[PDB]
Design a protein around this motif. Structure first.
Motif, PDB file in Angstrom:
ATOM      1  N   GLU A   1       1.919  -3.490  -7.505  1.00 28.43           N
ATOM      2  CA  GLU A   1       3.206  -3.436  -6.809  1.00 28.43           C
ATOM      3  C   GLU A   1       3.851  -2.058  -6.903  1.00 28.43           C
ATOM      4  OE1 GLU A   1       5.633  -3.004  -8.844  1.00 28.43           O
ATOM      5  OE2 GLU A   1       7.142  -4.641  -8.694  1.00 28.43           O
TER       6      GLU A   1
ATOM      7  N   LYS B   1      -0.754  -7.784  13.309  1.00 25.76           N
ATOM      8  CA  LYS B   1      -0.213  -8.811  14.221  1.00 25.76           C
ATOM      9  C   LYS B   1       0.129  -8.223  15.579  1.00 25.76           C
ATOM     10  CE  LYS B   1       2.076 -11.254  10.344  1.00 25.76           C
ATOM     11  NZ  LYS B   1       3.448 -11.285   9.727  1.00 25.76           N
TER      12      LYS B   1
ATOM     13  N   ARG C   1      -3.293  -5.644   3.584  1.00 30.80           N
ATOM     14  CA  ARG C   1      -3.133  -6.683   4.602  1.00 30.80           C
ATOM     15  C   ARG C   1      -3.120  -8.040   3.891  1.00 30.80           C
ATOM     16  NH1 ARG C   1      -7.415  -2.779   7.313  1.00 30.80           N
ATOM     17  NH2 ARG C   1      -8.943  -3.012   5.619  1.00 30.80           N
ATOM     18  N   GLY C   2      -2.959  -8.051   2.571  1.00 27.59           N
ATOM     19  CA  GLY C   2      -3.032  -9.251   1.758  1.00 27.59           C
ATOM     20  C   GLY C   2      -1.660  -9.901   1.625  1.00 27.59           C
ATOM     21  N   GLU C   3      -1.587 -10.958   0.839  1.00 27.53           N
ATOM     22  CA  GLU C   3      -0.453 -11.870   0.761  1.00 27.53           C
ATOM     23  C   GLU C   3       0.828 -11.312   0.174  1.00 27.53           C
ATOM     24  OE1 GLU C   3      -4.597 -13.465   0.130  1.00 27.53           O
ATOM     25  OE2 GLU C   3      -3.259 -12.071  -0.997  1.00 27.53           O
ATOM     26  N   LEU C   4       1.246 -10.101   0.438  1.00 30.77           N
ATOM     27  CA  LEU C   4       2.373  -9.501  -0.258  1.00 30.77           C
ATOM     28  C   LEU C   4       3.733 -10.189  -0.102  1.00 30.77           C
ATOM     29  CD1 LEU C   4       1.755  -5.756   0.805  1.00 30.77           C
ATOM     30  CD2 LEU C   4       0.179  -7.286  -0.302  1.00 30.77           C
ATOM     31  N   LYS C   5       4.673  -9.733  -0.961  1.00 31.00           N
ATOM     32  CA  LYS C   5       6.009 -10.270  -1.112  1.00 31.00           C
ATOM     33  C   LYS C   5       6.948  -9.733  -0.037  1.00 31.00           C
ATOM     34  CE  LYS C   5       5.877  -8.807  -5.515  1.00 31.00           C
ATOM     35  NZ  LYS C   5       4.719  -9.154  -6.393  1.00 31.00           N
ATOM     36  N   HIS C   6       6.588  -8.647   0.639  1.00 34.25           N
ATOM     37  CA  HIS C   6       7.346  -8.081   1.770  1.00 34.25           C
ATOM     38  C   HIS C   6       6.276  -7.634   2.759  1.00 34.25           C
ATOM     39  CE1 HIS C   6      10.956  -8.557  -0.499  1.00 34.25           C
ATOM     40  NE2 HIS C   6      10.406  -7.846  -1.471  1.00 34.25           N
ATOM     41  N   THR C   7       6.668  -7.259   3.962  1.00 30.24           N
ATOM     42  CA  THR C   7       5.713  -6.914   4.999  1.00 30.24           C
ATOM     43  C   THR C   7       5.354  -5.439   4.908  1.00 30.24           C
ATOM     44  OG1 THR C   7       6.621  -8.632   6.438  1.00 30.24           O
ATOM     45  CG2 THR C   7       5.421  -6.894   7.526  1.00 30.24           C
TER      46      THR C   7
ATOM     47  N   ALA D   1       0.134  -4.877   7.661  1.00 25.24           N
ATOM     48  CA  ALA D   1       0.233  -6.327   7.931  1.00 25.24           C
ATOM     49  C   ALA D   1       0.894  -6.565   9.256  1.00 25.24           C
ATOM     50  CB  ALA D   1       1.027  -6.990   6.826  1.00 25.24           C
TER      51      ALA D   1
END
Ligand code: HEC
Ligand code: HEC
Ligand code: HEC
Ligand code: HEC
Length: 107
Positions: A61, A85, A71-77, A81
């Motif tokens: 972090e 899209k 591009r993984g499951e992070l806490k903010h964009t 990521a």
């Protein structure tokens, strides 16, 4: 909130600098990027001391690189990521928004 920059601004890594343009992001909420910290607004530079101030590691972090490129499951964009899209819906922009070379970030 401070004034949004009206010109591209530097995002300094340890070895590369990428220019960030706010204008294409005018319909993105400021807080998507300038996320709250400790419940409070903050607009400090992402790599500020105490924030994402590891400019060389690729993961974690504290890693500026990770919070831009993951591009993984992070806490903010992260940048990549959301761009992933965008280019799903506008595939003509794939290289421009996600390429590692000859992209708008890394020309
Ligand atoms: C992500 C798509 C962003 C959105 C939406 C907004 N900002 Fe931003 N801003 C972003 C970056 C990556 C940077 C560079 C930070 C760095 O580490 O160098 C900035 C820069 C600013 C600044 C200057 C201070 C700083 O953080 O460096 C300001 C004052 C700022 N941005 C304000 C701002 C406002 C008010 C926004 C909504 C209208 C906004 N930004 C959107 C990324 C993104
Ligand atoms: C210190 C005051 C910070 C500033 C300025 C910015 N970020 Fe941050 N970020 C900070 C913390 C304490 C955390 C972890 C808690 C959380 O809110 O999720 C984060 C997290 C991120 C993440 C998620 C990383 C993960 O491992 O899930 C991203 C994608 C992120 N931050 C991006 C980001 C950007 C682009 C910033 C400048 C526009 C930025 N952060 C500023 C602390 C601080
Ligand atoms: C969605 C929530 C986004 C986030 C997070 C970031 N970007 Fe973005 N970016 C987004 C859009 C919708 C667009 C415009 C696409 C279109 O339809 O034209 C962009 C564009 C850029 C560009 C290209 C500007 C140009 O040359 O025309 C750059 C260089 C760019 N984005 C950089 C960038 C960075 C470094 C980000 C993380 C700090 C970032 N974007 C986040 C949507 C979103
Ligand atoms: C804009 C949406 C980007 C795209 C597309 C890619 N990268 Fe990037 N990269 C971006 C920023 C904002 C920065 C500077 C901040 C940071 O330290 O991450 C970078 C930097 C790099 C670096 C240099 C790291 C350093 O510490 O100097 C590398 C090696 C790098 N980027 C690699 C990379 C790859 C492999 C990409 C394709 C998946 C790629 N970047 C795309 C913004 C953007």
């Amino acid at each position: 909130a401070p004034a949004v920059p009206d010109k591209p601004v530097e995002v300094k890594g340890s070895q590369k600098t990428v220019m960030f343009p706010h204008a294409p992001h005018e319909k993105v909420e400021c807080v998507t990027c300038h996320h709250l910290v400790d419940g409070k607004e903050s607009y400090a530079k992402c790599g500020s001391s105490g924030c994402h101030d590891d400019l060389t590691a690729k993961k974690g972090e504290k890693s500026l690189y990770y919070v831009v490129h993951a591009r993984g499951e992070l806490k903010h964009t992260s940048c990549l990521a959301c761009h992933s899209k965008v280019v799903a819906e506008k595939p003509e922009l794939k290289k421009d928004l996600t390429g590692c070379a000859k992209s708008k970030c890394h020309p």
